[PDB]
DNA sequence: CACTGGCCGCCTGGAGAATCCCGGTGCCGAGGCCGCTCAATTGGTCGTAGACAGCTCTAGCACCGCTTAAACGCACGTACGCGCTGTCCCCCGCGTTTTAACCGCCAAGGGGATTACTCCCTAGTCTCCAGGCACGTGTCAGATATATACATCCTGTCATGTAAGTA
DNA sequence: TACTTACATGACAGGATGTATATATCTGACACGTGCCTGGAGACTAGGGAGTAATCCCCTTGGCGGTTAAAACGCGGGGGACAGCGCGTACGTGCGTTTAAGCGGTGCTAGAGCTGTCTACGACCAATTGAGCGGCCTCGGCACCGGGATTCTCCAGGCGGCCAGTG
């Protein structure tokens, strides 16, 4: 029930898929825990967002709507979860 | 017993049969259409309403909606609305 | 002798295929832990819904997809094919992060 | 002291004599090998590389001045 | 003793409802009033807006050859048209992932 | 005489003689403050509206606005801006 | 037999108007109805972000000599707090200039 | 009464000063008529706006607000004249 | 022998000294002249208020002194010192416009 | 191979210049006062929004067993950054000349703003009725699987330029 | 200094495999028929927000003379960009292994969500006022002008390495 070191579970050959979706041939070996960081920094944004979106819900899920909305507010509009 | 959730699911239907008679739709697709269309209307929606509170204005009208979508639809896409919009406007005064 | 590609074009194909395709580049597990994680570190005891966290996964993916597509402008601008860490740092720091 | 540092490029030169003449990192690290502080000395070793090839001991094997590859002459 | 009701949608000849985005208007709460031509003429932009993309993801899916639009689709046709990126820069669309855009330097030779 | 333009003027020239005695103010920075207080006050007002909507919430209370400050403020500039929120309403429901 | 007519910010021991900023929720349309803890707290927020960044203002202004706040001595004040610079990161105050940095490549060795 | 160019009357001192203010110490030569297009781009965006403000509101007179709403609706909020 | 500087001294200089300023940087009648160029495209013979004219030209410097704050990064971000127009079109593209 | 004097790269002091710092002085915006008015207040009333309690049900979490896809680690490799220097050229700095921006001063009038009148329209409510969504089903488009065919990428081979060995 | 020869390199063909192309299948995801009831809608009405007429004034536009600060242009020159080129590493790519993700199945439950209650809560209306705003007025903090130090910056001379000369 305790998680440790899952930022770690975002493996190097996810980053390297994540890149060539973006459209990079080669990626640096410094840039794997450092897009590690940013993508942990920017759950930190959206997940702290929806958190306050949850407990001003008075619920205890983190919905789908939540993540849409907190997403929405920082101009990261996503489409496709019933906004 | 369920509650009825609100969709943009026929209208899209049927504009996309209009537009190309043979041509189908997935649902993610549709649920794609619904966030476009619920994100337009807001954009539109609350640039109307600050137009509105600009000018104190309580009231919406047809020209406030106009000049939001001067203001947000870029180049080409706001005049053709502007066409569309006023032929609607149009056949609605008239009937 | 073995056939071995020389370096680049499996990259390529790599860039033509999930450019081409479009499903999910993050394991799903692990990407669920690590946000169960993060959201444990706020507020205690959330559970997720499993769209959320899809949801999140799209989100996070693309995200990605636009700070990579900024640190190849950035590495293309400077000479470079291979990106560096000052390249996010740019592209974060333009964007204003 | 010691000897100036024309005898050390020569040395350099000479060490290895590959196919290719030899580049001022490789060049400069060998100095380094043999004992010298290069880091203010590298206008130094531009005008020893320069005064070397001007004279015609050393021929400049692909690169411009001080930069490229160098490797010996005829004889 | 009463008119047959049809709808305003008819009244236009838009197949977007006016009287939803009429009542979305007035409790989505941008103003005390609303005039009436206000909803007619966003469902026609509206209608506009999802015809011409609509149109676009058909005739993407018509060129991969295949008969129901998809999500890359959409993202194929919003990506290749600049007034409809110019709407949709922030936007992100789900699975569907991006336009094929290799920069020039990344090509071989 | 004309028609009243409100302002914040005096309010705060009473907030800066209460943090700073003997520093004064000009125009051109009073009328920045109305643009300040104008700003955040619509940021608050905008996205608290919003946290309204999406709870299907019919009133705005000191919670969303809460939360509000929450979202937009970072960091310990929230979390003192909670502090200072709560002893304002718990003064007030002292009178 | 009517009572004395006090106001809600010395009830809540404000300086910033409860009354207006509840009039102009009331005005700016954003619900139907307000809560009235919701001006009070909002009027603190504002007090203190006014307080903190008047109180920066007036440092900035002891700092550079000057006993009277200048809109330099607000644009300073503003960017160089980095939590008050990620508030209005978006935001230009109007005569301020800008913060003075520059990049150390760009100066002499 | 018309008017065929002031493209040229933001001089290129004027830019050099911008770009003084901007922390540039160093300016290239191609930079000023290219940034002349852009102030006259990015002017299109906020003018095109500003007006359509101002006949939305039937007046002739170009005012300061309309200026201010036309700016932050880019996200480019200007303080220090609304009111 | 007159006294002479030698380059980017001054130039530094005035950096110190234009953050120092705060006053406007733009002349302020051509700048009305450009705005009435620009105004007379979408209608002619519009009149202006002069505090407009001037906040469009506060907001005029705003807009080019943050883009040259982006322009500077990305040119030492190609461990340059002078900036060139592919910075400018860099920072703009990564911006979003 | 050691001694040695002149020549170039570097250290240092000093002169001029831009700015900092110290005064004086006049001024015009900041602060303070006064009239006013309008917007906040208060108390009763009335309708109602959401908190609460409780029930139901459903999807989220945990557990488990296979089952490979992929994560991972290692090894060969090559290609990419990149440090350095040489070379060219481009933009800052400064001086002089030009010129229009600013000031400031004055005329005029265009429309912004305000007030008044008057009516167009729009929201509310009872009643009615029909369209879109849950629900269910059926059914072919596309993913998968399998079998062909070319593209292309690496590699092998031929021709050739060219540096090296040589008389 | 020319003759000869082997090696790097470009041109051309060929295999292998990854990708492109053709065909079966089956299945579940899309699409269509049903029930319905909820959301749209038509008539009427109370009433108000906004459209429109009039004015005034003031704030914008237009115009003229003077100053000079800002611009424009040329010379000069240094520094900045950048092309090239080995080097050295640092991922790219292939291959075998671990394993953990993924899939399929089962059970619990906790929380999401719907529904009756009602009570705190907030908006609304008549009357009243006192704090905030428009305007005026004064004056001293501050803008501007003038003079002396200081820091900064750049160059003149002066020292050390060093490179050439010599014994």
Redesign the pocket.
């Known amino acids: 029930?305790v998680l440790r070191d899952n930022i770690?579970?975002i493996?190097?050959?996810?980053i390297?898929?994540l890149?060539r979706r973006g459209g990079?041939?080669?990626?640096?070996?410094?840039?794997y825990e450092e897009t590690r960081g940013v993508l942990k920094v920017f759950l930190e944004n959206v997940i702290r967002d929806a958190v306050t979106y949850?407990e001003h819900?008075?619920?205890?899920?983190?919905?789908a709507?939540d993540v849409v909305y907190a997403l929405k507010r920082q101009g990261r509009t996503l489409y496709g979860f019933g906004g | 017993?369920?509650?009825?959730?609100?969709?943009?699911?026929?209208?899209v239907?049927?504009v996309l049969?209009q537009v190309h008679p043979d041509?189908?739709?997935?649902?993610?697709?549709?649920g794609i259409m619904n966030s476009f269309v619920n994100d337009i209307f807001e954009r539109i929606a609350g640039e109307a309403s600050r137009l509105?509170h600009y000018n104190?204005?309580?009231?919406?009208?047809s020209?406030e909606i106009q000049t939001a979508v001067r203001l947000l639809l870029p180049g080409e896409l706001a005049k053709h609305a502007v066409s569309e919009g006023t032929k609607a406007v149009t056949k609605y005064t008239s009937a | 002798?073995?056939?071995?590609?020389?370096?680049?074009?499996?990259?390529?194909?790599?860039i033509?295929?999930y450019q081409?395709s479009t499903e999910?580049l993050?394991?799903?597990?692990?990407?669920?832990?690590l946000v169960?994680e993060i959201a444990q570190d706020f507020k205690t005891?959330?559970?997720?819904?499993?769209?959320?966290?899809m949801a999140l996964q799209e989100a996070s993916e693309a995200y990605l997809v636009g700070l990579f597509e900024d640190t190849n402008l950035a590495?293309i601008h400077?000479?470079?094919?291979?990106?560096?860490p000052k390249d996010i740092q740019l592209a974060r720091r333009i964007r204003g992060e | 002291?010691g000897?100036?540092?024309?005898e050390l490029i020569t040395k350099a030169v000479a060490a290895?004599k590959?196919?290719?003449?030899?580049?001022?990192?490789?060049?400069?690290?060998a100095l380094a090998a043999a004992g010298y502080d290069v880091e203010?000395?590298?206008?130094?070793?531009?005008?020893?590389?320069?005064?070397l090839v001007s004279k015609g001991t050393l021929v400049?094997?692909?690169?411009?001045?001080?930069?490229?590859?160098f490797?010996l002459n005829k004889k | 003793?009463?008119?047959?009701?049809?709808?305003?949608?008819?009244?236009a000849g838009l197949?977007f409802?006016?009287?939803?985005?009429?009542?979305?208007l007035?409790k989505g709460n941008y103003?005390?009033?609303?005039?009436?031509?206000?909803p007619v003429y966003l469902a026609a932009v509206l209608e506009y807006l999802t015809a011409e993309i609509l149109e676009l993801a058909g005739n993407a899916?018509r060129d991969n050859?295949?008969?129901?639009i998809?999500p890359r689709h959409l993202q194929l046709a919003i990506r290749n048209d600049e007034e409809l990126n110019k709407l949709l820069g922030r936007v992100t669309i789900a699975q569907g992932g991006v336009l094929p855009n290799i920069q020039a330097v990344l090509l071989?030779?």
Do not use: C, W
Not at chain 4, 40 to 51: E, M, P, V
Not at chain 5, 1 to 11: D, E, N, P
Not at chain 5, 17 to 24: I, M, Q
């Open positions: 029930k770690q579970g493996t190097k050959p996810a390297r898929r890149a990079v041939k080669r990626i640096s070996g410094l840039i949850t819900a008075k619920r205890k899920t983190v919905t709507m | 017993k369920r509650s009825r959730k609100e969709s943009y699911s026929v209208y239907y049927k049969k041509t189908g739709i997935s649902s993610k697709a549709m509105a104190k204005r309580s009231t919406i009208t020209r | 002798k073995p056939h071995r590609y020389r370096p680049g074009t499996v990259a390529l194909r790599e033509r295929r081409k999910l993050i394991r799903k597990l692990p990407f669920q832990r169960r005891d959330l559970r997720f819904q499993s769209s959320a966290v590495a400077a000479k470079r094919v291979t990106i560096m | 002291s000897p100036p540092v024309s290895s590959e196919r290719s003449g030899v580049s001022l990192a490789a060049l400069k690290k203010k000395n590298n206008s130094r070793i531009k005008l020893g590389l320069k005064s400049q094997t692909k690169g411009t001045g001080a930069s490229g590859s490797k | 003793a009463r008119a047959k009701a049809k709808t305003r949608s008819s009244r197949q409802p006016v009287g939803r985005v009429h009542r979305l007035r103003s005390e009033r609303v005039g009436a031509g206000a899916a050859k295949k008969t129901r998809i071989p030779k």
